[PDB]
Amino acid sequence: PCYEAVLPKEKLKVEHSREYKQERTYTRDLLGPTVSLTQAAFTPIPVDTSQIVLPPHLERIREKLAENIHELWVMNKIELGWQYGPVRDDNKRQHPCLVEFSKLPEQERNYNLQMSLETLKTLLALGCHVGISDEHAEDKVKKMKLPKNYQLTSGYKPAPMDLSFIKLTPSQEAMVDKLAENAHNVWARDRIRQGWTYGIQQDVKNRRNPRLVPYTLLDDRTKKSNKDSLREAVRTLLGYGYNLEAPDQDHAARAEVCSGTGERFRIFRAEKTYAVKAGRWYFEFETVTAGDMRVGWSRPGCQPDQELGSDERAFAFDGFKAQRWHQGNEHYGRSWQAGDVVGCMVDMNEHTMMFTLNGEILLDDSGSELAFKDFDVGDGFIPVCSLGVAQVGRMNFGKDVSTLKYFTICGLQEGYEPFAVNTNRDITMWLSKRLPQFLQVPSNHEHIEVTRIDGTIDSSPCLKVTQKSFGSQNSNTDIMFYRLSMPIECAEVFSKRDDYDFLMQTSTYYYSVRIFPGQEPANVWVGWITSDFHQYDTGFDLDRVRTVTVTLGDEKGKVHESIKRSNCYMVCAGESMSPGQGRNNNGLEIGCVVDAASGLLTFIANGKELSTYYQVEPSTKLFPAVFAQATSPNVFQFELGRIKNVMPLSAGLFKSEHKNPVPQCPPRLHVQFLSHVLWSRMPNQFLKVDVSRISERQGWLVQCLDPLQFMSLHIPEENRSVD
Amino acid sequence: ATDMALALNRYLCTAVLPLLTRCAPLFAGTEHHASLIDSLLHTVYRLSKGCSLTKAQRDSIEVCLLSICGQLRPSMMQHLLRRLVFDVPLLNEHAKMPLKLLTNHYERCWKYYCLPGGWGNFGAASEEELHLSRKLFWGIFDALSQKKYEQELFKLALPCLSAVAGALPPDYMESNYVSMMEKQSSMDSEGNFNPQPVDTSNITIPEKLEYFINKYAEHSHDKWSMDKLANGWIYGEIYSDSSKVQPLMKPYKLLSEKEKEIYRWPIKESLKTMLAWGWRIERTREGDSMALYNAAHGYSPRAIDMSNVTLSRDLHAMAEMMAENYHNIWAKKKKMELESKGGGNHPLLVPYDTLTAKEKAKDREKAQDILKFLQINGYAVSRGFKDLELDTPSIEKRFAYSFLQQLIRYVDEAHQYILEFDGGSRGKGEHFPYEQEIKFFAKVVLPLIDQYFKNHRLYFLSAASRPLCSGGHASNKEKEMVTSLFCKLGVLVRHRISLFGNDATSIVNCLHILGQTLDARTVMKTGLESVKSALRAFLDNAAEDLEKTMENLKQGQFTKGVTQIINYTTVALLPMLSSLFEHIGQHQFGEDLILEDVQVSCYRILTSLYALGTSKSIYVERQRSALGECLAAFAGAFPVAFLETHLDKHNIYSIYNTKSSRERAALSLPTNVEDVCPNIPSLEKLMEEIVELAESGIRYTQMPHVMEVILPMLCSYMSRWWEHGPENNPERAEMCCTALNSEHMNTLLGNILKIIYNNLGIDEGAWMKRLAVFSQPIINKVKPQLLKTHFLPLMEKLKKKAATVVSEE
């Protein structure tokens, strides 16, 4: 059952799949990216101690450690009240291992020694220095006697060394905590190698133990047991006198950047149409958390993927560093805390901006109150904010003046107006889009350039992709995903010199790619993608593509059909060639062929057919696409040519040219690339859903009764839909 | 000496260099021309080193190079710093300009060298750069210590040393990095340029690489065939270049090995230099698989074009390394050729760093081509596999072995300086024990340590528990030795103020800064017993000197030595103690510091301070000013209530509360918690005193010590004992110690405000600025409801004085 997967310190809550999809007011929580290492939970990564070497002093003190571990264990058992018993009786408090160590069962003795040497080997492994303090003190410190109650029934004498004078340092306490974490890790690793798993309830039948969790999640009971056992271990070591020094603490520089590769921050702005070009304006920014957050005024042309203030498009305040951001950063104001209020005001008809923290004016390095004092009006300003990982903000535009908590303190007297001072309806949000989308390559793009080579009597029409910035300053070297603006649609139902009649009849289309010499062919993937492809991953391989297999058929009479569904059908150019290495005298040509009548996808190497093929579902739209990591100024070149007995791509792309064997590259067809520079519009109203727990027996009711519709504009050639 | 040299120098220094000085701001960003501007700087510095130049020409050189370097980006001129680092220390006559340039460069790039993120958008200093800075720093110490006294030379040496010390990040920089890198440099470093290519005679190629050698010989023949058809050469059975026919355009497969060995020779030299430098080649399965996997006349008109292939960054530095070796080999050959001839001087004889990109082009392309052919065949060259162990990771190599702790150890200059005075004071002479070392210390060490500690204010008091600094915090035993620089307190004895002379102010300012730079918590928790003894011994000595000052002010001693003792107190002892006690009170270090015997000495100090405050004698009449700052500092620092004695048992830090077994009576004690302060101050006594103050018609000029000493006592005292738990739960270990602070301090808020109001009401006043500073922490406690109706009379008194001043003048 699904309730058994709950973490012990959490409760089941039927919440929204999305984060902003809640019908609310200006009090809506704007959320930045979230650190994505939440539920990985248990991944056993123990400290490897098999490689290390045991010094002779630790070697001959090892048996002393093992022995004293034996006495401390029997002391704990006898003081809790255990007694010798052939069978394990927890309720009766009987223990079989409570035996003379020599006569003790050999397997339990191997345990008692393996804990000891693994403990000391871990001590060695994580860099603890072992040194001589006083061998005379080691010889002096002896074991005193114990009363008959502390004497175990087995006849042995628990002999406690001088624990009275032993003191513990905080560094030793910290390394002992590390040792407890490592011991829990190795134990649970062994448990899983036996075959156990985690469960909210302990069940031997299903081999589920709620203790297979990270040490931080581990309950204090076993955690305190490890604490105390390791107290006796470390105090045994200190009584033996070989002093230990743990390595000094290391600062944390990971910066907790665990968001997805698409986003490191999220930008929320007002709509462009709400741009103000003259007057006094004020708005409020509440900071539910304190961290990497910026707030200010942005030009309509501000980019979602760029940090606020890193360019001329935005004037921002960053309280995390107590800085102001516009074409760089300068120290400005103080740093906020949790639950603070930043009032941003712009007085545009004499071109000034000021920021207030909790109603207090913020100053420059000098005594000047003006954050930015000379900016051309241009096309106006709109409220904007940027939030980093695990950051929660709120923007109040002053639609209800009473909601502003510091407008009266600063701004009402100065004559500044709330941004939504007189608006009959709520202002519209726009967010940095999370899913990348294909869009035409800009003519002013920094890195890539697309040139259209007109076809001739000898050369077919082509579209060459080149890197403007290759070999130049700080050029981006990442896998970029290009596609063609127009798809090939497979047949709605599947049937179950080249010949001119065959050309006329056939529904087979061809295109090719030329990977230029000097460009790594192993970094180029060629094939087809659907409109559902949005995976912008720095490391792309043909094994991480999304794929499903839907099997239809009675299980009694076996599966009668299986269909493989995917959004990417490509082959690597280097694997396609594999003629060894080399042979890069001329650009490598890979030809993609699609038979739309049968939905068959085939690929051809430099004159030879490849072994990789695909079969797509009927009515599938396939976009020609190339994924390339640039290792050359000239990377690759789409070629809209044709081969024997195969129609050109333009025939399937355009209905007018359906029966035109002459290859063509009409102006509508162009090269688009996957990008993050797009905006998403928050709906002004969400579905009102009610979620509750009726009872233990009934379950979790969710209810949605009020209808809510939106009008969808469909772009047909891109197979896309927008509001 | 030739007329051409003079005329050329005149032309340069009158037309070229001033123009570059005028257009220096244009050198902001030169990412393209790193080599070009490095060549410019190297040539300019070579002209500076050159002799037979006039003073005006030298000044023009200096100003031009200073402007260019100042406008230049920190990343480049690394080679210029290399040459300066080698040349400045032994130089003491032409080092004026290089020293000033280093000072300006380090002052500009202060953040770049120290801050781990660097300047900002420029990265941080490389390990080689910071090691070079280390070498410069220590070489300048050695040269400055050994050299004789020159006033202007030292006046430049001190700022450069301070700038380099501030720039080098004291926490880690490299911890001397064990410094296993020993990259040989041409003795252009050691004078003029002669190249010394690394010998590869003992190096022999393995019998494994010969497939690669043969294949690159094939590629070399391909390139020479490209020469063939570019020049238009044609196949010929005989050698005749005059008839424009190429000898034997015919494949290496069947060519003789003689000229094939000629092609092989550069390959062998390259690989022998490879192995002599000690990098070795690893072979992948891609390359090895290819090795195992692989018409008439018509030699291949196609060759693999390699300019398209890219190279990794480390391999690029490698290619630059081979390029500089190749240029060294060529320069050496040309040098023997010119030596065999008569005095030849080829323009390209300058070192690789002084070369320009156009001249570096052939060496760079050859090195990149050989590396790219390696990469294509699948052979990867390996750099730090030799001596791959370095053992630092900042874990085994604590602190800074050769900069920070070596600097603080070389502060033993102060200990030997004390020893020198101990030897010399017994009949101080004109020649001194060692006047050179005396002057060196006096004019170098004190300002150096002062500015260094001011710059690294934040680092030393940064701690793991309290993150003062975003970077690494100060280290164990290095905080202890920083405290152990209290040898500067072991010196400056009562009689040594005149012996220092004008340096008394310098040393007391240095001591101010060093005392502000202290970590008492770490010193007591993890410190050496001798250092603890030195600290407690100095504070005991300060208490003893204050008691001696009381014997002086008794008038039984003043009725020479007494006057100089009093002057020592006033000029050093009182301000330095005031600063140290302000620091410990600000950082709450007084609780850890003042425990038992320091507590005894602090009660002695207190009796002294209150005694001089109440001393109406005119001798301390001038001194009453800073006496006020001192007793306020001690009141805000000392951790046991002074004027509340009935709560000594409640207080946990009391001397009796800590050592009531035997030690309190073992030591010299007043035997009673009320007797610990034989002076008058008691609670309601001083309430009533400050109430009647300025209400009984008293005048500052009549008797000013009351409002000059007692209010600052009250100010700092209530400041920190309201730092002691404000409005917590009483009797629960939060106000056992104080309890009574809940309301009387709140009422004497208004008491002191009204006293100030009466002090303004009386006609004349300027001392309240000190009183205003002392009252600053108090008005922080003042809430708005009692700033209303309480600071309005402050405005009334302000306008009253304004009107009176306007009417009078």
Ligand SMILES: Nc1ncnc2c1ncn2[C@@H]1O[C@H](COP(=O)(O)OP(=O)(O)OP(=O)(O)O)[C@@H](O)[C@H]1O
């Ligand atoms: N010689 C021994 N005598 C008693 N207990 C031992 C001995 N050696 C190991 N153990 C501990 O007893 C456990 C046996 O019980 P089991 O395998 O069911 O797990 P567990 O009691 O949940 O373990 P743990 O206390 O480590 O979480 C071992 O996992 C181990 O932790």
